[PDB]
Amino acid sequence: LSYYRGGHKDLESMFELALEYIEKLEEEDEQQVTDYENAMEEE
Amino acid sequence: LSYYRGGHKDLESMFELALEYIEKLEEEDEQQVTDYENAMEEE
Amino acid sequence: MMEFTIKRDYFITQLNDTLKAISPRTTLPILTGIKIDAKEHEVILTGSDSEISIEITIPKTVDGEDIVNISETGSVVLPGRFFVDIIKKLPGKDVKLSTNEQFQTLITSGHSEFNLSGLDPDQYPLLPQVSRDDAIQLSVKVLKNVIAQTNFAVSTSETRPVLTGVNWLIQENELICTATDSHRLAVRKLQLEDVSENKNVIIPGKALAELNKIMSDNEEDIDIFFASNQVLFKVGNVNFISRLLEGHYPDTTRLFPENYEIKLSIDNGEFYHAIDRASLLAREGGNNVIKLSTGDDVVELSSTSPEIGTVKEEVDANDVEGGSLKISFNSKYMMDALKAIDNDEVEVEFFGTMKPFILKPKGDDSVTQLILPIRTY
Amino acid sequence: MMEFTIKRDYFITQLNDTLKAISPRTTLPILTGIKIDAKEHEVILTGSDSEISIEITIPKTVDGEDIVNISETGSVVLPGRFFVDIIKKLPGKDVKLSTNEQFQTLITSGHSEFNLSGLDPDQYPLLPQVSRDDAIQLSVKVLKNVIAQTNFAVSTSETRPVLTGVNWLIQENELICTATDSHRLAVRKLQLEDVSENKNVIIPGKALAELNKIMSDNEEDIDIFFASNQVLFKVGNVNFISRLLEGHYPDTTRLFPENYEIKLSIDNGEFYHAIDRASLLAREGGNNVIKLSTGDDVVELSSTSPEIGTVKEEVDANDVEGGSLKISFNSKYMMDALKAIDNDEVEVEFFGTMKPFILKPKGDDSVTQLILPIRTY
């Protein structure tokens, strides 16, 4: 999950300087929230 | 956190039928990811 | 050794359709990828997730202009989301894929030159074959209207996996598209132009929200072919196989009571944005429940919350019958049922304080949304 | 008992500025709210989070048209994000707040009528007062250019809380705006029009990214007033207090070596979108490192990854000196430093294979971005 955590934070730091459009980070963010909820129901 | 979990899921189910614009759900989604990461470093 | 040079501005808009069937949750490592297959005159993009599957034949010419020039025929299974992310970023208007042995594709576009690692297409599973009888021909505007007016009211919970699909009940030249999550109901009546057999099928909820996206609003037709387990939405130059759900769909004709007490004739924009405003207080609590209070020519959309306060709108209902009534509904189930109305004057009628209430447009006796009461007990 | 009736289309765009200082993480329950204070001729919207604080005087007239009509003076502290969420949804073009005792405001706009629960404004903390000497007058275009060319290179890690702010070094009519996160550097030189004292201040990174948003691109001026701990960005009809960071900013003049080996003159759009393409493979791994390879009139932006493959661009560098060089940089630090260049022809010069390299525009000797090497060791 730390692989996809690093992937999401790299995509967000390449969003907050407008290097990436908002819809891609929106669906990628919902994918990360799904992964977080799976990791919280797993623990 | 289940209060804000219910708040985020109610805001997302009122996004996926286009009843809410994407920027509001984007910043609200990043707020939920911040709350999830605080809850995972707390546990 | 596939090798073709497709125009990028068309390959993106025909590849972003077959991306919608690629779900990144499938247990097979091959179904998370797009199968590109260039034959002698066309390129098909089979994207599947063992539930829905999209096959998009891209011919060598579309409306006169040239699109693909296949230099050598073959096939490869590139990764799914990443390859569309490549094609959306390339600078040129020509994308020349060229597969070699061990299936590595050199995506050359002007100066840029990617080199992916596609998989073997011989281990990609076969497409489900659907027999070309049981033909139902809708239009694109009519079927996008049906999917907009019915596929919001499907269930998102797989505990009852029959309510997660849209029932299509064909019997004697009539199409009855219902969708229930045991809180809503959206029955679209529709008369066809031909004769069709008695079908009782359950097309899934996420198998038509991904069809509403891949249909551009045109004058073409969707020849819908039903099978025992699959359904083919043969739109123009794009197929759409989706799996019919099993089980018997529950009878929703018992959820239609009669003898209306009050009958509003309210605007759609006013009474939609007024639910959008009146649920602002009661959605930060997590729940979304709005009390309504019908009066003479007014609809007093109220809500309250501790520590935040009180909201009270007043919407002009153009024609009200009966008396006054204080119903307490759900705001998402009202905003979805008002977004589905194409008309700008819905005709709400309420059946008492603890029963469902019809939300239908006036002038149209076909579509009747229904909201079961989530009032207090 | 505040009571005023402000035009909504102006109150949203002057309330969404003072929302940007309301952060929903402050330990006080009063600093998460907007203080609205209607005086006899103006309405101020003090929004703070004990680090930055925005006071926006909304007068009774803006460019001739009437805006506010204060019926009774007073003040209230409404909740922060929720009140802006209310005002963005109201139907009318007039929003009439009316506070009572115990501070409950009746937000009436046409038919809608909210009733919030504001707090006591007497327990809201006082605004930090900044002395009106040490005046530095920039323009809006010049200061938005400085914030765009410098405030990307601040540190987001509070382990070293001096690198999280933009240094402004005023000495003899020259402004030197640096920003370092020990991997980048962005030094904007700027000559002023007046004389100013020797200032060495550290304005924070998120105290100018929230100033770049609230400045509409106009011909007005930001009278910047410095104090010992605070700085006043007095834009037209909007103040902006922000807290200067403490400590000594580290000397970044030792990070400027000389005797360039190679010197490109490359396009900005081509070499920006080519970094945008070449980092697609190496950003799904999580890291973002692109190998560069300078050749004769080419810049071979390469990357690789296991299980995905290889990308190799070729960007036309219009004038290259020296020889060939294989540097391995970071793609976000290059895309930020190419987005900051207003010009369409940057002039990259490289200092060997293990040293920082200048990324400056040609024709401008003021702004010189610098990227420290994150090449292999």
Swiss-Prot record, chains C, D:
GO terms for molecular function: 3'-5' exonuclease activity; DNA binding; DNA-directed DNA polymerase activity. It is found in: Cytoplasm. The keyword Nucleotidyltransferase applies. Keywords: Cytoplasm, DNA replication, DNA-binding, DNA-directed DNA polymerase, Nucleotidyltransferase, Transferase. Its main location: cytoplasm. GO terms for biological process: DNA strand elongation involved in DNA replication. Belongs to the beta sliding clamp family. Confers DNA tethering and processivity to DNA polymerases and other proteins. Acts as a clamp, forming a ring around DNA (a reaction catalyzed by the clamp-loading complex) which diffuses in an ATP-independent manner freely and bidirectionally along dsDNA. Initially characterized for its ability to contact the catalytic subunit of DNA polymerase III (Pol III), a complex, multichain enzyme responsible for most of the replicative synthesis in bacteria; Pol III exhibits 3'-5' exonuclease proofreading activity. NCBIfam families: dnan. This is Beta sliding clamp.
